[PDB]
Antibody, heavy 115, light 106 residues
């Protein structure tokens, strides 16, 4: 939740409520899907809790979480027209001896529209 | 990053299909495949190269080496239509453009 219509330059905070698993042992990620169906990685944290973003939103989006209240947040700032899209969050796993790379869904979306 | 070919894939029920992805650097075997059935969020099929998730039927299998990975459906069933996406996480967490599978019918 937190989506909606947006004028360019605005700001917005999306949320993501998780249940049954805790954020204390699970990681969550932000991925969007634009109207032309293309999927993009918005932001991620590692197992050590380090954060990364692509250039596209670098400096504008800020991922964060509350291991206590089981919440994942996306704080978009200086919104552009190209941020219009459905936003999902997912937990990452690895079971394989390496990076927890794959974002495993559980979000039903939340459409942000910048116009 | 990732390149997915083909873009569209008309296939008949019972047919086999293959979708492949390539990357720009070496990615060991860290690669997933997602199915986004229409009107729903995406779902996981195979992860870390070739490894059926715990509800995916065995008609789906994954493989690949160096930079090219392929998803194979041996007998295409009706429920399998929608857009498939490869996701590559050895280097840095990117999705392929998508391959829409459409059921060829009479």
């Amino acid at each position: 939740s937190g989506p909606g219509l947006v004028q360019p330059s605005q700001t917005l905070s999306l949320t993501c409520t998780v249940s049954g698993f805790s954020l204390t042992s699970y990681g969550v990620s932000w991925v969007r899907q634009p109207p032309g169906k293309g999927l993009e990685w918005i932001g991620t944290m590692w197992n050590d809790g380090d954060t990364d973003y692509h250039s596209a939103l670098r400096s504008r989006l800020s991922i964060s979480r509350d291991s206590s209240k089981s919440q994942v947040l996306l704080k978009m700032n200086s919104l552009q027209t190209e941020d219009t899209a459905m936003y999902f969050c997912a937990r990452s796993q690895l079971p394989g001896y390496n990076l927890r790379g794959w974002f495993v869904y559980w979000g039903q979306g939340t459409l942000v529209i910048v116009s | 990053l990732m390149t997915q070919i083909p873009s569209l894939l008309s296939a008949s029920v019972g047919d086999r299909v293959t979708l492949n992805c390539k990357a720009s650097h070496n990615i060991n075997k860290n690669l997933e495949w997602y199915q986004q059935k229409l009107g729903e969020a995406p779902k996981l099929l195979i992860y870390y190269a070739n490894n059926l998730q715990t509800g995916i039927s065995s008609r789906f299998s994954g493989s690949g080496s160096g930079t090219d990975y392929t998803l194979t459906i041996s007998s295409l069933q009706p429920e399998d239509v929608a857009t498939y996406y490869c996701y590559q996480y050895n280097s840095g967490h990117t999705f392929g453009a998508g391959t829409k599978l459409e059921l060829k019918r009479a």
